[PDB]
Amino acid sequence: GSHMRLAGILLHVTSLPSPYGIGDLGKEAYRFLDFLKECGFSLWQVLPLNPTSLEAGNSPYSSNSLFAGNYVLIDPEELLEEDLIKERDLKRFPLGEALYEVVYEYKKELLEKAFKNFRRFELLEDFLKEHSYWLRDYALYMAIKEEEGKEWYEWDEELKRREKEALKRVLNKLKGRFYFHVFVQFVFFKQWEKLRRYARERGISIVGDLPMYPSYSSADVWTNPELFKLDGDLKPLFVAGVPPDFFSKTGQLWGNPVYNWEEHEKEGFRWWIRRVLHNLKLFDFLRLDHFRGFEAYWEVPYGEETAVNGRWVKAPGKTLFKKLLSYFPKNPFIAEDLGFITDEVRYLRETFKIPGSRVIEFAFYDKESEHLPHNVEENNVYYTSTHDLPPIRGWFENLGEESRKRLFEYLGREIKEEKVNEELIRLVLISRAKFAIIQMQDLLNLGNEARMNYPGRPFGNWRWRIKEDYTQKKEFIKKLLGIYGREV
């Protein structure tokens, strides 16, 4: 048999066991890629690399920029190698949960110190040209936010509405601060470029993640207000979310401003094209968060406390993706098409041959679930579980008797709770899904304590890190990949 059959691991950079309070793009990232290669994995899925904040619960999906990189993921040991900091500035922390509060402050201090002892500004100018379409705006956005200590919609009216002359004045004023913020982005993107080359030379493709929406408090809304549904004062007229389920009682209010899609179509979808081009500098595949929003999105009036009184509004997905697939004909797209799926959505997805998502954790609530292995078609990415879900072992712990029965009957036997991960990994690998992805927590057989994110809950999330030597799992998982024809 000679089919396209790949396997991968879902693991966010923060979860790497790096020594400085959080995972980074340094030694441990390379060690993890070595582990991928040795096992025969071909795929690595990360979450969005956009800057995070305490205010937004450290969520990768609520950032002040859809383009920028997150400075807390920077490896500070490269700063030591380039003689930008001293050895005593480095400061080890024991392996535990991601120390967001402390790394925001600590890595900012290391980068402030490195910028002082820096020097090669000509390399910064070439970087700025390459990323001119977003970085001039982002670095200036960050410099003004620093000075005024306020969000963009609270700034003086002239800077808020991006009057040409006012932008020039404030740039020259905060010139030193402007270049600090490009320097931070320079350091991040150069470290990712190096890591990406290492991955690519070993046949590993990186699956990145594109959030549907920016946060209202972002350089993106600031720079392109007409691309969102705002009123005369640039406050949101409508905001994003999803309607009430039988899961949730009153839906979720995401609080993003919604797109004015008629304006995107008017400008030939060039903002979305720029998003894709930018992200393809980093990633091989782009997972489209809330894919169903390209067919229709839930829109609720601003000022509403819940998402109950919204409505479905059609978006121009057919026109958008026709243009995107013309610009990017090798098709980097993966659809996150879980939840609120209709046949309209499935038709949009399949019209453009975009692989869907399936998750075996969803397979045993119904006897004919489309997430059962035998129902997963080739053009799909098949997960054991995702970062929005409990790891398989913790899911199984709380699984109801009826769903347990369905699981046991599918395997043909009752199995002990500690063996469930292995059994479900096998089911995912034996499927004909072209990409099979195991969440790292499942590989390590971890429970509810290792859950990355709990949707609905604002805080406590995105903190899980590897604490153990995961390379001990290599002989077991390597064997499995080879048995099910996904070892390369």
UniProtKB/Swiss-Prot annotation:
Where is the protein situated, by its record's location annotation? Cytoplasm
SUPFAM superfamilies this protein is in? Answer: (Trans)glycosidases
Q: Which reaction does it catalyse?
A: Transfers a segment of a (1->4)-alpha-D-glucan to a new position in an acceptor, which may be glucose or a (1->4)-alpha-D-glucan
In terms of InterPro entries, this protein maps to: Glyco_hydro_77 (IPR003385), Glycoside_hydrolase_SF (IPR017853)
Recorded protein name is: 4-alpha-glucanotransferase
Q: Does the keyword Glycosyltransferase apply?
A: yes
Q: Which GO terms describe its cellular component?
A: cytoplasm
Q: Which UniProt keywords apply?
A: Carbohydrate metabolism, Cytoplasm, Glycosyltransferase, Transferase
A Pfam match? Glyco_hydro_77
Keyword set includes Acetylation: no
Q: Name one GO biological process term.
A: carbohydrate metabolic process
Tell me where on the tree of life, at the top rank, the source sits. Answer: Bacteria
Q: Which organism is it from?
A: Aquifex aeolicus (strain VF5)
* Major site of localization recorded for this protein: cytoplasm
GO MF annotations, alphabetized: 4-alpha-glucanotransferase activity
What family is this? Belongs to the disproportionating enzyme family.
User: What Gene3D superfamilies does the record point to?
Assistant: Glycosidases
Q: Which gene encodes it?
A: malQ
Q: What's its EC?
A: 2.4.1.25
